[model samples]
Target: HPETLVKVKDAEDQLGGRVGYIELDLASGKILESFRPEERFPMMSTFKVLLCGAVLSRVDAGQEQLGRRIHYSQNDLVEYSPVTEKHLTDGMTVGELCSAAITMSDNTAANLLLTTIGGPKELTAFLHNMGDHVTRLDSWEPELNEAIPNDERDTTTPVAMATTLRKLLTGELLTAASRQQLIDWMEADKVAGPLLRSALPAGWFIADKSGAGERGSRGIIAALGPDGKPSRIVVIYMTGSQATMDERNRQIAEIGASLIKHW
Candidate 1:
């Protein structure tokens, strides 16, 4: 554990920020490696995972339907609307929106999902219901990425994020079908694919979502392991640096590299 902490510190020193991470066995709930795990980091797009989960929660309660289509106009589109912009005419189903939001980190798609689940405060409420009192969503996309130092808006600690993810994935918080859908979307994520996957060993399965924002804030939450076996949960978050996005990414990837090697 000391060596793992040293590796985390070395990466943080190079990235010039407050870095936090928590890696735990999905089955045993054991903390494998961690550093500054209680510190808050901007959630950025990483919150989309829970956003979608809240909507899925509604579906489980029979209050909402994923196949229900929601139509929006051009005014609904915001920056980084890659998936939503193309389907403005036909609109998109609730399920599709969740997919776009998680797999592509689509801003407009996330906003739509956020609205479907009743806005920022409601998503925060969902987290609270799951016993995750530390994570919060204070605003919509673009604005949420402000990532101002010492500001807690739209932020979550590494341990809190990882615990919630485990509850959703392996625990009974979500129905099996809903949980699998979320995991499927995460496995299809494109944002962190190149950087993080490159650091992982061949054939290691990965299901994750990533976030980036102001002040070099970057984070990843993942369920990872060898092909066809139980996986471990990993959450790494960083903020408060002036480093380049590339630099931040490489450092996180290196942290990921060290994690795999530590096992």
Candidate 2:
């Protein structure tokens, strides 16, 4: 009966390349559809979802407070990223930092938060304790460290990353308040390039995060349709693209549009 909803052959035909999808019936925990659920891929900015969780978990535990102020010290200056360089002003609240981190993919906010929250090692341990072994925190250094050559910097498989996102959406990772906050912040994301955001209908609320780099790009588009029900779609598209960033983004958008249309 479960197999009737999503057949492997059908999925293979629909998604030709390295792909994975999982739709859970939140009320019943029944898997509505899935394909290659175990495959791993680079998480890119989608990794931020897990980091958000770790940060919120601290807040929920009373170890941190969203309203508490965190000033942007001189060390927080990251020259390589626009979000970090422009938004890292002095005397910002924890909530503001988290908001910018998710909504704008602010490298400065992320680095500052990472440093304030005990860096990548602690974040990795927190994720592991929550049963997310495939996701990792690689960019512990400054924004420019993204160019560093290391295995930890390049993280995640498709299956694990998507699962992590699903957990975030379903509120399994944070308190109800924190979960709602995360969704709200994600919905405010300003960088809606060609990938997931390009496919949705007008007025459709898509709460997601995207990441792009030399290797490729990736994203998770959780679309809330007009009917008020959520259609969760996780997309991780990475390629050795010879095209310019704009061209590659267009290709990614085309792929997402096709998938959304069929799904």
Backbone clash total for model 1 is 0
- What lDDT would candidate 1 get against the real structure? 0.86
lDDT of 2 by residue, 87-153 (tens): 4455677788777777777767777778667887788788788788876775653432344223345
Q: Tell me the TM-score of each prediction against the true structure.
A: 0.96, 0.80
- Which pairs, if any, clash in model 1? none
lDDT of 1 by residue, 1-263 (tens): 22557877987888787889898899978887788888888888899999988988899999889899999999999888889999988999999999999998999999888887789999999999999999999989867765475568888998999989988887778899999998999998987864567677877889999998888888899998987553899898888889898888888777777777776
lDDT of 1 at 183: 93
| Best by the lDDT measure | 1
Best by TM-score: 1
